[PDB]
Amino acid sequence: SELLVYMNGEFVPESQAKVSVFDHGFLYGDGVFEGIRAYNGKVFKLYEHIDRLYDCARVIDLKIPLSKEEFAEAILETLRRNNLRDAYIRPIVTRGAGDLGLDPRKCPSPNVIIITKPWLYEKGLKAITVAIRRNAIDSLPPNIKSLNYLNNILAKIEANAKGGDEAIFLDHNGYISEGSGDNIFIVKNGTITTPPTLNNLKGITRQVVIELINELEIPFREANIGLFDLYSADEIFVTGTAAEIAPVTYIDGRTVGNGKPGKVTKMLMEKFRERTENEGVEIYR
Amino acid sequence: SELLVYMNGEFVPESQAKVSVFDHGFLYGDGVFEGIRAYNGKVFKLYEHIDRLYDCARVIDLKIPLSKEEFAEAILETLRRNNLRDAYIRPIVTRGAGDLGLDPRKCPSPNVIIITKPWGKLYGDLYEKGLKAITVAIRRNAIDSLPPNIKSLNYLNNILAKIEANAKGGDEAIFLDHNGYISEGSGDNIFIVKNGTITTPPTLNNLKGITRQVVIELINELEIPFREANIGLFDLYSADEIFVTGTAAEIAPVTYIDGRTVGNGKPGKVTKMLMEKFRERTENEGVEIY
Ligand SMILES: *Cc1c(COP(=O)(O)O)cnc(C)c1O
Ligand SMILES: *Cc1c(COP(=O)(O)O)cnc(C)c1O
Ligand SMILES: O=C(O)CCC(=O)C(=O)O
């Protein structure tokens, strides 16, 4: 019955899946995480997510105590044990327990945890530009998908109070960065632009969509953009594992085009759907 | 006997003190914390620490589900139950569990934890000889991204800094902020002494330290010339003395920065004086546990 959580090789019922309060992952958000979809029995972009996890751990100087290969098998086993076919997966690696101070050298053993949960619109999201700026590349690099997500939560708090489904960050230079958990793209006179990934995160969904754009031969640039570009865009959409491709039909109360998902967004959304149908790593095989 | 840990009113044996993996404090470092010292049956600056806890919670829009008096009582109750007289206290309030996503409105029940342990002075046998400090390449979290004044569960900025100092020959990391101003150590405030004058950064780009506040009180009482002002690398490299402050560390002298000898190479006169006046305060003040 009850969903099981992978916890260091053990499979434990959801309601009992718990970590020592002395884990630095808990005390200090000292760890990294991923987000992964399974569609109809296949895991989409499994190895792109695992590689990013290992990069993020490396950036925080954390050794994940599983080879990448064992990590992929643990993800598939966790899904099998729970009999999932359509699912959202959340791997997490933490520093493990130490003493009460910051020093990671006192933390001999990382915890590895994998959560699995069973699993757009023709309306579109209302996006809100936030006062809080993205974490800076030289303080808490935003490319690290770490458990330090309070930057993102502050932005989400603002979007909640200010009539937004989604918060849009700028960085310190005034460049558009990304949504609180999704990359951003705009479309203007048939050309698509998205920020370079430096001040945001190297999204897997963003990467797939760049591939689709190049398959459709739509003019494309990866270039820094600003408010002026957001407020005069023909279309706007955000991307991420959970949201997939989500049209953004309003920005700060301003209607984007006619307020309905745009042509280019919709083409990308259907090419992206085929891809999630036809490619992935089969769970039951 | 095993140490007990407060968990929403329950007192749980240390080794069974555990948090659901679904708690947003664990998924997202979505909470705040404190650090408090009990010295010989008293809790030093109990109420101040509690005030800061509540301010930090308000900054993250997190409603602590105890009144301040209840929180104080919980801290004292946890210490009593452990028969502790000398302790480090780590209270923690998190957002609790909600959806898997980051939306805090979907999280109905904050989670309140209070750890109490004996825990030696951070530095801990370096107070006679002094710390070797290293300025780090990583800058402090910016005031308009992740305000460094929040004592939050998002401490990877501080940890990245500590990792650099580990690899680069230092006991402590010194942050600058994005302007090039000196900010603080990874876990403590910073003071410098030059020609008899003490300078410390305004707290905006660092953290409003309770120890730093006590030291400033001491500086004023001792009538030492004192300035709260932004400073840079030039000031660090030319200082007669350097020291850092925090609950765990107390007052620690810094005798090397980036391998350069600070004055003498041993704790300065002003630092040692303040260290002595500070020990006195830890003896005469506090809320009685028993
Ligand atoms: C996970 C994440 C993304 C999107 O990444 P995908 O790999 O497409 O799921 C974007 N921004 C932030 C801040 C994230 O945490
Ligand atoms: C807790 C803390 C300090 C020192 O605060 P006190 O109230 O003196 O203990 C300084 N800097 C940082 C980053 C901290 O987390
Ligand atoms: O140890 C830390 O995480 C930061 C500093 C602190 O909490 C303290 O001085 O008690």
Residue numbers in the entry:
A (entry chain C): 2 to 120, 127 to 292
B (entry chain A): 2 to 291
The authors write:
Branched chain TAms (BCATs) catalyse reversible transamination of branched chain amino acids. The subunit of the archaeal BCATs has a PLP type IV fold typical of other BCATs, D-amino acid TAms and (R)-selective ωTAms and consists of two α/β domains, a small domain and a large domain connected by two inter-domain loops. A dimer formation is required for the BCAT catalytic activity, since residues from both subunits in the dimer contribute to the active site.
The GEO1900 holoform (internal aldimine form; GEO1900_holo) and the unproductive complex of holoenzyme with the keto substrate AKG-(GEO1900_AKG) have been determined to 1.9 and 2.2 Å resolution, respectively, in the trigonal space group P3221. A contact analysis reveals that α-carboxylic as well as α-keto groups of the ligand are tightly bound in the active site via hydrogen bonds with the highly conserved residues Tyr89, Ala249, Thr248, Arg91 as well as Ala250 and Gly188 (via a conserved water molecule D238). Comparative analysis of the holo form of GEO1900 and its complex with AKG reveals that the binding of the acceptor substrate does not result in any significant conformational changes in the active site, except for the rotation of the side chains of Leu101′ and Leu103′, accompanied by a small main chain displacement (distance between corresponding Cα-atoms is about 0.6 Å). The structure of the complex GEO1900_AKG demonstrates that a major difference between the subunits can be assigned to a movement of the inter-domain loop which has a sufficiently different conformation in subunit A, where the ligand was bound, when compared to the other subunits. Thus, in the A subunit this loop adopts a conformation which shields the bound substrate from the solvent. As the residue displacements were only observed for the A subunit containing bound AKG, it is suggested that this could be the result of main-chain movement due to the substrate binding.
